[PDB]
Structures are given as C-alpha cells and as structure tokens.
Amino acid sequence: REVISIHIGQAGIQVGNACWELYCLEHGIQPDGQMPSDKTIGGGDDAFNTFFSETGAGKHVPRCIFLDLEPTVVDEVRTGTYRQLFHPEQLISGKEDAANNFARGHYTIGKEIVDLALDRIRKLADNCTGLQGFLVFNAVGGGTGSGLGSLLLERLSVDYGKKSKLGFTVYPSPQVSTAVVEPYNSVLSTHSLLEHTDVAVMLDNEAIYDICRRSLDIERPTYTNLNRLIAQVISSLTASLRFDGALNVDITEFQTNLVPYPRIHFMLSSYAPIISAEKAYHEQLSVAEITNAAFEPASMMVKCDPRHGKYMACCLMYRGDVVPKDVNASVATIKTKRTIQFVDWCPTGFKCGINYQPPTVVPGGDLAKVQRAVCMISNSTAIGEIFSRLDHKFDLMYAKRAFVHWYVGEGMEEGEFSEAREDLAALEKDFEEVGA
Template identity: 40%
Template sequence: MKELISIHVGQAGINIGEACLEQFTYEHGITQSGTFEPQDNLSSSNSCHTMFHESESGSFNARSLFFDLDQDKINHIKKGSYKSLLSSENFVLGKESSSDIFSRARCIAGHSILNECLEATRKQVEKCDSLEGFIFYHSVGGGTGGGLGTLLCEHFSIDYNGKYKLSNAVFPSPDISPSCVEPINSMLCISYMIENNDLTICYDNKALYRILYEELYQECPIYEDINRLIAFNVANVTRSMRFGGENNCSFREIKSKLVPYPMLLFLTSSYSPWTPKEKAYYYNYSVKDITCQAFNPNSFMTSCDIRQSKLIACSLNYSGNINYTDANNALSYMNLESPFKFVENESKKLSVNINPHTSIVNPYSGLAKTSISLSTLCNSTGISSIISLVSNKFMSLYSKRAYVHWFVGEGMESGEFRYKYENLRALERDYVELEKNHD
C-alpha cells in the first residue's frame, strides 16, 4: 500500500484539513483517540496506512502537516477533536503574518519557516515505505496558502523529484471576494502552479455553496460544510489508492490519462447524485441517471459549464454494483442526446473505472449514502473561465498599479508581475487554441 502525505497551508488549507481528518478517520475506522475500530468490511487495518502512520504502541497518527503564518487555525486544530492523531511534529507556525500578501508570505514570512516546514516533511517522508506523493490543500487567493504553498511545492519538486503533487485549490469565487488583493495573489499563485504542480483540482466557494443550498437543501451553509464536500471529493479521488482493487489508480495514471498538455493541469470535479440525507429513500437511481447528472453544470465543484466547452479528457469513477456495459450504455445515450465535444475528434478520452464498494459518506455531511454513485475528474477547456476571471481582475488592478507597491516592497520586483502574468496569458491562449481547433 502506498502512502500519501497531506500538506495543509493557510486558513482554507487547515480548515479543509479538519474535514479531511473527519472523513478519513470515518472511512478507515480510526477513532478520535487514534485507535483502530473498524466500522464495516471496508476498513481493513492495512488500508488506513495510506493516510495514517501506526506507531509502535499501535496508535495511529495522521500523515498530515499544517503550516500557517497565523496562529488561530493551527491552535484550533491542535486543541480540536483530532488532537490525539497529531503531535507537535505535524505543525509549523510562522513568527510573522503575511498581511494577506502573497509575496510577503512567499519571500519573507514563509521563507523564514521554510526549513522547519521542509524538516517536518522529511520526518513524515521517513515514516513512509513507498510514498506515492503529496496532496496540497490551500486557497489560491490567500497570502499564505498561495505564497507558502507554492514555495513548498517548488522545493518538493527538487527534494522529492518523481513524487507527484496534487493540489486541491480553492479559487476565488466569481462574485464573493473577501480581500482586495485576492486577484493579485491568485494570478501569482496560478502562475507558480503552472510551473511546479502535477495536477490541480479547482474548487470555488460559489459552486460549492450552490450545491449545498440547491442540491442538499442546507439553508445557511458555512465553510465547515463546504470543506466536507472538498474532503469527500478527495476521498473519492484517492479511494482506489487507499483501498486497492482492480482499478487502482495512482497519481501517475491520473496524470497520464488526464493531462496530455503540460500546462493544462487544472481539473474540475463533479459528483452525482447530490442527494440530501433525508431524501435518501425517495430515489432509486439508474446508471443513466447518475451519469447524466454528473455532467450537469450544477454537479460541478467549480463554476464552469463543461458541456458547453470541450473535453480534453475525463475519468468517470463509478462506485457500487455497476457493470461496464451499463456505464458504456449510459455514456452512449448521453452522447446521442447531446454529443460530448472533445478537443480532438475522437471519443477515447473518457475513461471508466468501477469500484464495487459504495462511496463512504461522512454522516455529518448532509449527503445521502446511495447504492451507486459517480465521481468525475475532468480536464476541460471550460476551466479557462475561472483562469480568465483571475487574469482580467488582475489586469484591471495592475493597469492602474493598484496595490502593486504592497507587493514590491515585500519581496517582489516590479518586473516579475509581467513575467508571471505572461504565464497565465500563455495558459489562456492554449485553451483558446484547443477550443478553436479540431471542430
């Protein structure tokens, strides 16, 4: 069994970390005090070693690291429900704040704790027999999540060359933005991610709020609810790595299937059926139902419509008692009703995996456990809409040099903005080219 190390950076990263601990302890039958108490036949003690390290005394510790420049979130998780699964080796706290500025987090405040973060990582890596890679969790628009997150990713590319890095990145929402410098932070973060990440799953809070509100009927969803959806998605993506099975999908395979062009590593994800817990008994879904729903724009965790754009590649991960004939029939039906548009004129870019076990739903999530479900990972030109949103908002500030002096005084040179922005423009152009070609 391969191991995965989770790296939680900044507020969003750490908050999602707590949701991940809730999801993964539940799935693997680990109690809050770190003992193994299997809940069902899936939770074999072997499967939990991907995410948890077993100490000599037999208790389990999470293979998770929490890095931040503000103490609030770190202190919260240190004292929280999962404190017994963590020790001082799982945390690094900075000495000065980023003041929300990417360059300050990356070049000054983050840089001063870089060695501690690398050392904490080295200790986790030492506890692994066969490390698969790192899963990062962070926001794109936060100073620390973006700045320190990308700095670490860059160092891991050198220190752990050949190990895969998957980012779960919260992108700025189209119309919810808590900080005036978010577009600048986001532009810089995306530009660094293009250079150093293997795969990035994009989320935006607007899309996630909509799922909670419209699909799961939660009246006042908060970050905690959103974060449970992100944790659930990561659980679905990593399920075969954790539990094994014939469709054991490593990061290497995901990357080779979904990322044919090196810069276009930004993925979006959907799930179906998004059914509220209290409605579980009203519905009896067919494979066709869940397949059609999974491609509905409302099922995606990013605000983009992939049916109106072109698919570069997509993996469909079914769970439950489903056979390949039913899955392929459902896809053919969809294709007849409204043909998939691919960047090239061929339809071999949909890969189907079937895991015979049903998805494991965290009882606090408000989501119903259903006998069959589908989780997708899509590489689509539609994702360019959230990249362009960042790039346009950045340019409208940068053209007036708004806030630029906050960054230049804090570790960046003014020329770097242009250079980093060019990376984003090149990415946007690649998407436009793919949209145009192969019609």
C-alpha cells in the same frame, strides 16, 4: 501505496480538518488516534497504511502536515476534536501571518518556516515506503496559501521532482469574494502553479454554495458544509490505492489519462449523487442517471459553464455496487449526447474506475448514506474562461498601480507583476489553440 498531504493556509487547514475527520471514519479510527479493540468494521491492515502509519501499540499517526503562520487555527485543531490523533509536531504554526500578501508569504516570513516544513516532510518520506506522491490543498487567493504554498511547491519539485503532485486549490469566485487583493495574490501564484503541480484540481466557494442551495436545500450553507463535501471528493478519488475493485485507477493512471500536454492540466470536478436525507429514499439512484448528474453543467465544483468549450478527457471513479456493464452502456449515451461536444483528438477520452466500498458519511451531516457514487475529474477547455476573468480584473488594478507598494516596498518588484500576467496570457493562448 502510500500518500502524504500538506495543508496550507486558512482554507487548506479547514479543508484538511474535515478531510481527516472523514478518513478516520472510513477506517474506523477512534477520534483519539487508535482502533477499537472490542469491535471492528471492514478489514484489511493495508487499508490505513496509505493514510495512518502505525508506530506504537495501537496509535496511528496520520500522513498529513498542517502548516500555517497565524497561530489561530492550528491551535484550534490542537484544542479541538483531534488532539491525540495528530502528531504533536505535524502542526506547524508561526507567530505572525502573511495577511493577504504574496510577497509576505513568499519572501519575508514564509521563507523562515519552509525549511522547518521540508525537514519534516523528509522525515515523513523516510517513514513511508511506497510514496505515491503529494496531495497539496491551498487557497491561492490568500496569504500563506498562495505565497509559501508556491514556495513549498517549487522546493518540493526541486527536491523530489519525480513523484506526483496533485493540487486541490481554490481560486476566487467570479463575484463572491472575501478579499480585496485576491486577483493579485492569484495571478502571482499561477506562475508556480503552472509548471510545478502535476495535476491541478480546482474548487470554488460560490460554485459549491450554489450546489448546497439547489441540491441539499441548505439555504444558508457555510465553510463546514463545503469542506465536508470536498473531503467527500478527496476520499472518493483516493480509494483505488486503498480498496479492491474490478477496475482500478491510481495516480499514475490519472496523470497518464488526463494530461495531454505538460502545460495543460486544469480539471473540472464533480461528485454525484449529492442528496439530502429526505429526498434520497424517494429517488432511484441508478448509475445511468448519476452519470448524467455528474455531467450536468449545474453540478460542477468549479464555476464555469462547460458548454463554452470541448472536453479533452474525463476520469470517472466509482464507489459501490456499480457493475462494469452499465458504466459502459451509459458512457455510450454520454458520447452520443445531444448537448456536449468532444474534440476530434480523442475518440476514446474516458477512463472509468470502480471500487467496492460504498461512500461514507459524516454523522450529523446533511448528505445521505447511499450505495453508489461517482467522482469525475475532467480535463476540458472552458477553464480558460476563468483565467480570462482573472486577467481582466487584474489589469484594472494594475493600470492604476494600486496596492503595489504593499509588495514592492516589502519583498518584490514589478517585473514579476508583468511576467506572472504574460504567463497567464500564454496559458490562455494555449487553451485557445487547443480549442481548435
């Protein structure tokens, strides 16, 4: 039950660094790439085989490749906390960088490193045996994250094709943004992201800053906090391949339960109960209320009001001593709740799943240590609002033909500027007709 991960772009690598500092925490791997011999925590030699393949005496080589063009963050990892852990070659760092240009990332400089990336992904595939699928992490509003990320997604779908593709991507926020050409670089990559990612799970920098401000009371959070609490979600949903459980839900269940159509896979996320180390032991963290906290609108990782549409399906992974009774008794309350509205398609649109491993916590982090937690991924219809926003703020720049030379004179032309927007119009049409 093996899974590998590729991390692309500034956001991708910064997510992956925290993500793989948390996995070594869960599996008790020392920060130098091996397992302690004097003591141990937990058990199960097949737990780490999904993430840390062994080749040597005790050293574990992970199943992730960190690739980027700018050699500023990859060598930051190479000199950071984790040097012996990572394989000296799974860290790919070019010389120049895409620099907010999709054409640069997908047609001129990302095309000479994608083959080097694929000829290591193939080696990792030969290494692993029960390869469940790929889990990609990238920012669509940047350079290498969008351009060569789309390139590599297309090439992977051509090469393997059959195996699962779980994307954990980052669109821009509706108002908060750290780029000027982000609408272009997002509505360009959406073409590849639409028909190549098997399941797309979405993030939002602003929608997580607001969460940090209101829940953990970190008034001025940052990327470290955000990427820590996204590593949390990734580990929470990737626990059914690693640990036991009364009701298991792995990648095949995800794709069979939350994808009612080939071109309708866009997921709201949530992770309850997020709480600091002071207001944790004063509260009664029961399943019947962590489910309500997961389903409340102001606690979703994606900036979008869920009331604007109807849920299509939901999947609820669980960690901790959650019995299989209260989950049902509370999903009943959810289905009879007075504020949400399901669509008449599915009278049964829930897929629970339970593990027995309580959630982990990074030492020196702002999240408390608690017995139980839930991560919910929901296929809904309100996400079309995001694409409406992106199209409306892309047409404003396309009308004036601004920033267009930076693409047409470099690698590409205007036909794809037209087609990558007509595709988004079609996607909006699809969500609108589903809303019926």
